[PDB]
Design an enzyme around this catalytic site. Sequence first.
Site, mmCIF file in Angstrom:
data_model
loop_
_atom_site.group_PDB
_atom_site.id
_atom_site.type_symbol
_atom_site.label_atom_id
_atom_site.label_comp_id
_atom_site.label_asym_id
_atom_site.label_seq_id
_atom_site.Cartn_x
_atom_site.Cartn_y
_atom_site.Cartn_z
ATOM 1 N N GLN A 11 43.155 73.017 93.240
ATOM 2 C CA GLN A 11 42.525 72.272 94.324
ATOM 3 C C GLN A 11 41.576 71.201 93.795
ATOM 4 O O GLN A 11 41.617 70.048 94.239
ATOM 5 C CB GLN A 11 41.786 73.226 95.256
ATOM 6 C CG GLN A 11 40.970 72.508 96.316
ATOM 7 C CD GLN A 11 40.253 73.462 97.243
ATOM 8 O OE1 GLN A 11 39.071 73.286 97.538
ATOM 9 N NE2 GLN A 11 40.963 74.481 97.709
ATOM 10 N N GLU A 71 49.518 76.757 95.740
ATOM 11 C CA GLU A 71 49.596 76.836 97.188
ATOM 12 C C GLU A 71 49.531 75.421 97.740
ATOM 13 O O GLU A 71 48.901 74.547 97.135
ATOM 14 C CB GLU A 71 48.468 77.704 97.768
ATOM 15 C CG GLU A 71 47.930 77.222 99.090
ATOM 16 C CD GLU A 71 46.548 76.639 98.953
ATOM 17 O OE1 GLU A 71 45.975 76.736 97.850
ATOM 18 O OE2 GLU A 71 46.036 76.090 99.946
ATOM 19 N N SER A 140 39.591 72.585 87.575
ATOM 20 C CA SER A 140 38.339 73.325 87.605
ATOM 21 C C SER A 140 38.387 74.470 86.601
ATOM 22 O O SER A 140 39.461 74.949 86.232
ATOM 23 C CB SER A 140 38.051 73.872 89.006
ATOM 24 O OG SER A 140 39.035 74.806 89.416
ATOM 25 N N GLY A 146 43.375 76.267 88.251
ATOM 26 C CA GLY A 146 42.739 75.309 87.360
ATOM 27 C C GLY A 146 42.416 75.892 85.999
ATOM 28 O O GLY A 146 42.497 75.199 84.982
ATOM 29 N N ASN A 206 29.316 70.809 88.801
ATOM 30 C CA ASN A 206 29.130 70.600 90.233
ATOM 31 C C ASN A 206 27.662 70.646 90.619
ATOM 32 O O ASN A 206 27.242 69.945 91.544
ATOM 33 C CB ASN A 206 29.913 71.642 91.034
ATOM 34 C CG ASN A 206 31.324 71.192 91.352
ATOM 35 O OD1 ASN A 206 31.672 70.024 91.169
ATOM 36 N ND2 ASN A 206 32.142 72.115 91.841
ATOM 37 N N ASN A 228 33.743 64.240 95.200
ATOM 38 C CA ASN A 228 34.904 63.683 94.513
ATOM 39 C C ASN A 228 34.825 62.165 94.418
ATOM 40 O O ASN A 228 35.226 61.582 93.405
ATOM 41 C CB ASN A 228 36.185 64.121 95.218
ATOM 42 C CG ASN A 228 36.441 65.603 95.070
ATOM 43 O OD1 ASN A 228 35.948 66.234 94.135
ATOM 44 N ND2 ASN A 228 37.212 66.168 95.989
ATOM 45 N N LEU A 252 44.044 56.771 74.201
ATOM 46 C CA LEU A 252 43.413 58.086 74.215
ATOM 47 C C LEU A 252 42.978 58.523 72.821
ATOM 48 O O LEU A 252 41.945 59.186 72.673
ATOM 49 C CB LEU A 252 44.371 59.109 74.820
ATOM 50 C CG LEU A 252 44.903 58.771 76.213
ATOM 51 C CD1 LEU A 252 46.031 59.716 76.597
ATOM 52 C CD2 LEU A 252 43.783 58.823 77.240
ATOM 53 N N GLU A 254 41.551 56.909 70.696
ATOM 54 C CA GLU A 254 40.247 56.337 70.387
ATOM 55 C C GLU A 254 39.100 57.171 70.947
ATOM 56 O O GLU A 254 37.978 57.074 70.441
ATOM 57 C CB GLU A 254 40.179 54.900 70.913
ATOM 58 C CG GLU A 254 39.108 54.037 70.268
ATOM 59 C CD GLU A 254 39.331 52.552 70.505
ATOM 60 O OE1 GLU A 254 40.433 52.181 70.966
ATOM 61 O OE2 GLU A 254 38.405 51.758 70.229
HETATM 62 N N1 LIG Z 1 33.893 68.813 92.326
HETATM 63 C C1 LIG Z 1 34.823 69.503 92.973
HETATM 64 N N2 LIG Z 1 34.922 70.864 92.773
HETATM 65 C C2 LIG Z 1 35.870 71.572 93.432
HETATM 66 C C3 LIG Z 1 36.748 70.951 94.310
HETATM 67 N N3 LIG Z 1 37.570 71.903 94.811
HETATM 68 C C4 LIG Z 1 37.234 73.097 94.268
HETATM 69 N N4 LIG Z 1 36.171 72.905 93.424
HETATM 70 C C5 LIG Z 1 35.486 73.908 92.595
HETATM 71 O O1 LIG Z 1 36.486 74.645 91.917
HETATM 72 C C6 LIG Z 1 36.147 76.015 91.867
HETATM 73 C C7 LIG Z 1 37.207 76.801 92.626
HETATM 74 O O2 LIG Z 1 38.464 76.622 92.019
HETATM 75 P P1 LIG Z 1 39.662 75.833 92.742
HETATM 76 O O3 LIG Z 1 40.000 74.551 92.009
HETATM 77 O O4 LIG Z 1 39.310 75.571 94.185
HETATM 78 O O5 LIG Z 1 40.877 76.898 92.681
HETATM 79 P P2 LIG Z 1 42.357 76.530 92.155
HETATM 80 O O6 LIG Z 1 42.317 75.675 90.910
HETATM 81 O O7 LIG Z 1 43.135 75.853 93.256
HETATM 82 O O8 LIG Z 1 43.008 77.962 91.803
HETATM 83 P P3 LIG Z 1 43.339 79.089 92.922
HETATM 84 O O9 LIG Z 1 42.465 80.293 92.669
HETATM 85 O O10 LIG Z 1 44.788 79.488 92.779
HETATM 86 O O11 LIG Z 1 43.107 78.534 94.308
HETATM 87 C C8 LIG Z 1 34.792 76.152 92.532
HETATM 88 O O12 LIG Z 1 33.808 76.092 91.527
HETATM 89 C C9 LIG Z 1 34.702 74.923 93.408
HETATM 90 O O13 LIG Z 1 33.362 74.539 93.604
HETATM 91 C C10 LIG Z 1 36.653 69.580 94.513
HETATM 92 O O14 LIG Z 1 37.420 69.004 95.285
HETATM 93 N N5 LIG Z 1 35.684 68.863 93.841
HETATM 94 MG MG LIG Z 2 43.476 76.736 95.157
#
Ligand SMILES: Nc1nc2c(ncn2[C@@H]2O[C@H](COP(=O)(O)OP(=O)(O)OP(=O)(O)O)[C@@H](O)[C@H]2O)c(=O)[nH]1
Ligand SMILES: [Mg+2]
Lengths: 438, 349, 54, 422
Positions: A11, A71, A140, A146, A206, A228, A252, A254
Amino acid sequence: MRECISIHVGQAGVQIGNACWELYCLEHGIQPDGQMPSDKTIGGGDDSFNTFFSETGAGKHVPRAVFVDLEPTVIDEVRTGTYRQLFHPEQLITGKEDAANNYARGHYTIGKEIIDLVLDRIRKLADQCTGLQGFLVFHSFGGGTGSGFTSLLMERLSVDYGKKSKLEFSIYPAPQVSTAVVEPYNSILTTHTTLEHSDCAFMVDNEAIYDICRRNLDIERPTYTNLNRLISQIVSSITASLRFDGALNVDLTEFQTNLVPYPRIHFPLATYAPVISAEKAYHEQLSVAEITNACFEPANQMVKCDPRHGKYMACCLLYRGDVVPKDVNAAIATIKTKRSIQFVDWCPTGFKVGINYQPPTVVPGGDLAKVQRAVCMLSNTTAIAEAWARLDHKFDLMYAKRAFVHWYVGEGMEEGEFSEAREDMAALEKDYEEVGVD
Amino acid sequence: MYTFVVRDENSSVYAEVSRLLLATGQWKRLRKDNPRFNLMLGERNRLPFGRLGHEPGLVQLVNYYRGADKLCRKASLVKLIKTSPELSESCTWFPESYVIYPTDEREVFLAAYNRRREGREGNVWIAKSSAGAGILISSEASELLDFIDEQGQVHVIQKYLEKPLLLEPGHRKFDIRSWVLVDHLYNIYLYREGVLRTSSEPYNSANFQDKTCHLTNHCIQKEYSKNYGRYEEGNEMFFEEFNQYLMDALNTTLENSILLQIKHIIRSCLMCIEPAISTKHLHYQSFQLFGFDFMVDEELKVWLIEVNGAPACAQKLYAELCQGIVDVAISSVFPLAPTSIFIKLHHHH
Amino acid sequence: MEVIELNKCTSGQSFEVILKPPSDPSLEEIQKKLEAAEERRKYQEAELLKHLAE
Amino acid sequence: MREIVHIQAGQCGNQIGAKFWEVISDEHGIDPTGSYHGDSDLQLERINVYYNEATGNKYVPRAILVDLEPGTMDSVRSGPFGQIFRPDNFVFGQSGAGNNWAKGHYTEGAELVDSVLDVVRKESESCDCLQGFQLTHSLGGGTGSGMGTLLISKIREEYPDRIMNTFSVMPSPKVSDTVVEPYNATLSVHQLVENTDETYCIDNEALYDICFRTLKLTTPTYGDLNHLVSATMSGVTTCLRFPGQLNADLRKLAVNMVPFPRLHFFMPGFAPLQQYRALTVPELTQQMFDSKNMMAACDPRHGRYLTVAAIFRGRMSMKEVDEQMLNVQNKNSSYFVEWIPNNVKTAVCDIPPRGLKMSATFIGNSTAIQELFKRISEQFTAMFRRKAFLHWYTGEGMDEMEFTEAESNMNDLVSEYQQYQD
Ligand SMILES: Nc1nc2c(ncn2[C@@H]2O[C@H](COP(=O)(O)OP(=O)(O)OP(=O)(O)O)[C@@H](O)[C@H]2O)c(=O)[nH]1
Ligand SMILES: [Mg+2]
Ligand SMILES: Nc1ncnc2c1ncn2[C@@H]1O[C@H](COP(=O)(O)OP(=O)(O)CP(=O)(O)O)[C@@H](O)[C@H]1O
Ligand SMILES: Nc1nc2c(ncn2[C@@H]2O[C@H](COP(=O)(O)OP(=O)(O)O)[C@@H](O)[C@H]2O)c(=O)[nH]1
Ligand SMILES: CC(=O)N1CCN(c2ccc(Cl)cc2)CC1
Ligand SMILES: CC(=O)N1CCN(c2ccc(Cl)cc2)CC1
Ligand SMILES: [Ca+2]
Ligand SMILES: [Ca+2]
Ligand SMILES: [Ca+2]
Ligand SMILES: [Mg+2]
Ligand SMILES: [Mg+2]
């Protein structure tokens, strides 16, 4: 011209990717339909912006990007969003249920079954590149996808593209904008397995972005859109050299050469200025010296920490807007006489500077004011080790009681991978101390 | 309801500060490992500053400035005075000192030493290190260097004040302890009450072997000195008595003859390092209590000896000073539901 | 304070300032990891189904 | 499309289940005939989570009504929203369970369970991606307790990797139907320790005291107790049924709420509980954390919270919410474990429940829940030591050994809670 392929995982990576490509289009004059009036070569060309965009015969400029999420809810915002027309459907890959904030689930259980598909789609983008530089991977630390899927993807990318650089934009977990408690686990698990595969990683805390949005933009409770849009400005500042004419950070490779003397210590600290609220009546345009001095204020950093108590190994100044070298050196000398800038003795006390004349672009109707000049400093400091210490301590608190461990073991991960990943982070903390402290 | 943690069970000062906070019924103590706290009474060494100021909604305050060690380490202080433009040029109040390892200033020390020997001048030096209770006073350079190699830690050799101001009767050395509080805004508060730690033995410049009349430490006087507590209770003379003495003996006052220089020296040291330790724009706030130790020579010139970052206090002064800490340092950031005991050394930030 | 390698173009310029001079796992091995975790999931599930069978 | 399959078993389970569907049907704009008539698209964005879509824009709950006697389910089919349920999803017998766990679990229930699973299979097979199951039932009776836990075991056998949650009504001598309830509850708790990912513990004693002391109800009725349960069930599922910055399925929620597999029993709470006055955010937060607002009949000041989740519904200052939440923890941190960083999480939802400008739902994983199991274990042992009323169970094939094991299992659970409270 050498192409860069951007990969957005989970996400956070997807939504940040969405915000960056929106900004890129506004910076390069690309309409939502993919057309680009200023591009006189139709369906072809080797311009700077072509490192990030390909072109169809019909004149569409297509991002060299892949979006991956286990998802679909987040990627559907892209499929139907303003820039839905920019991407081919094959570029947006979605499973049906996520990793539930479980690194083991994203890396092993689900990663095993979707990795080959993602590689195939990435391979199709590589086959359009005459000289692929490498990949930019957004994700993330805290998410199950992530963290878990990214580290699997990074391992496989090292196999399939050995000679290619890989850069990360990683979202460091902050409780103020998170409802998860296991993110320290996912962060350490993913850093351990990704470490030897990432040539350079820009961590964004964050907590820092949140405070900058509350403090400078007067947003009482920032959303992910506010975060974002701000993060995309910093990302744009970093990737600008690859998309525009220039001589600094032109590929990259560099980024490692100028920012990473020691491979494991590849986490530069990012600082941005100025961040001015759009709702303001009308701010006084800051000078080169002022925005440069702001680069040494802790409140403008992407990771909250105190660089006055670390050592610098490298330092890049990236200016956008009305900036001339004369003003930069004047400001630099002034700052060396006031600030606490301790360099490592085995590195020259210098700054590589880059100036792009096009001033920062802002999304119309956004929170950020249009400024005439802005800067992003990339400095490799031992001070960023504070972020590892903080995160490692939270890991230790929960791991002493094995709290939540059963969720990872249940997905096929061995408990030994925890302590193996933690001991690697302990060695990483020791590396920083051997370079920074006396 | 404010929360605080205790991480130095050996702090006599903050044991009383913690006792006062709990008395107000508005401060609650937590386990030393609980991160959800407003005030930390931290440990002396390896205080994890990197973990402060990251708890959502919690204003966090700590009783130590990260980086103040530069001032409270023997060798660090010497380096700071020599490499700081705010100090080295006109630092007429710090005895000539050299950092000596067992970079290193061995050769530079000898150059100044040979100069004094050749010029008939008093060439007595004192070697000391932070790892001391391990002090040596000698007029021969060979002994001073051979004493450092037998050890294994960094030492500093500085000029021994051969003409100290001697109190009468007794003909005895002494030193002055000044407590200074720096709050989160970096106001410099000098406690109105200092203490002279006096030597109960007659000063003898012809025998640096018996170190009881040369070292005015409260422990050395209460251990090796045979006249402990003869003139003043506990070899401790307070400002009221010392000021009256200066009026009867030298027809001067403690303020004019000495206190002006002390205030100037405190401001010089603290202002110099302000840019490097200030928490003004930081995610957490700092304050700290300092123990400045001074010497006074027979010309009524004040000399800075060292700065203690974890100082103790005089028994008679714990109550007043500790209340002042809570007043200006803690309650200023966490208010509760005079005639200040401090002296504000105003300055430009 | 020296400026070196000044590069100028229409879209900007870059240079370097010096204040002071100085003083992998194969594809096979990744498969084994993924399949080992999958196997431990199979085993743990077999133990659950065995438990439910009892 | 993260579908949830809802099951309600026994008298208690079906009466609470019926009120739950009545409540959320109102929130989602679904009338008793299954037709949508709301005014906001937020009401339909996640409507498929609990409702199937039929021909003619009809929304039919994904619910299965189970019982060993027809009585209660005949009431549902004739109740307010009775017509909204799928006729094929009524699975019931005639013998009944006689408030006997052995009858619901081993004899009467075993004869009926296969046809229930046929309906579960039918609902799951039409799910884009099954999120998991939720069961409403009591633990003190026979069908919901004995057959309910049998259902969970057979569901887990067929869907081993799906989340299984329950809303479980715990017995109490104050609001007791029969003296064998401690037997039925103890036998069920062991099943739940093994086979559920999350169990919301609803203590009828707490519901009663709230009706008598807080709500000022002279003579409470099951209807009154069920109004609190419905309101609570709507609160805990608000993040699943409406859009918001939460976006989390059952497994992600379970991952962050359950640090140890066996300690997955939650204490829910609701607020508010002079009725038109506007309730400020401080009043929501103070009440929500107050014991007199919780339904576990446990004093949280007797244990420590492993994890705490709070859902605020209504147009309110999210800045002021964080200020109050961060005030309760930082002003009572002695009741939170310090080795799970940031174990208090808050989420806001703009759509308030019916007739309330704003509300707050509380979900706590507290070690104080051990007091609830201690009370049960004490009543169990007092009878079991004399083998009182055992013949009702040995007459159904059960042996005394199975009781001894259940006694040991729950006492282990209490010991497991106690060690984390220290
Ligand atoms: N800066 C920023 N942080 C985000 C964003 N979306 C989620 N986060 C951060 O990411 C972490 C949660 O992980 P996600 O990226 O939402 O989860 P995912 O990578 O989709 O993995 P899943 O568990 O399968 O959903 C938390 O620390 C959130 O604050 C975003 O759009 N911007
Ligand atoms: Mg997710
Ligand atoms: N250069 C010098 N000239 C004269 N006396 C000196 C001196 N250096 C140290 N002393 C004597 O040593 C005593 C203080 O020693 P010092 O402070 O260096 O050791 P220390 O730090 O272990 C004691 P404290 O930290 O408590 O003040 C003073 O009483 C002073 O008389
Ligand atoms: N809160 C509540 N509790 C109930 C209700 N009906 C029964 N109970 C409780 O549930 C237990 C009786 O179990 P019951 O559901 O009637 O048995 P079953 O039909 O065999 O599953 C007793 O502890 C009752 O107090 C109800 O409608 N609401
Ligand atoms: C014929 C046709 O529609 N196309 C264009 C889109 N294609 C594509 C595949 C994978 C990726 Cl990553 C990107 C683009 C396939 C070929
Ligand atoms: C269905 C379920 O598992 N739950 C428990 C956890 N829930 C929750 C609410 C708010 C926040 Cl911030 C986090 C988690 C919602 C309900
Ligand atoms: Ca072109
Ligand atoms: Ca590599
Ligand atoms: Ca039968
Ligand atoms: Mg000392
Ligand atoms: Mg009944």
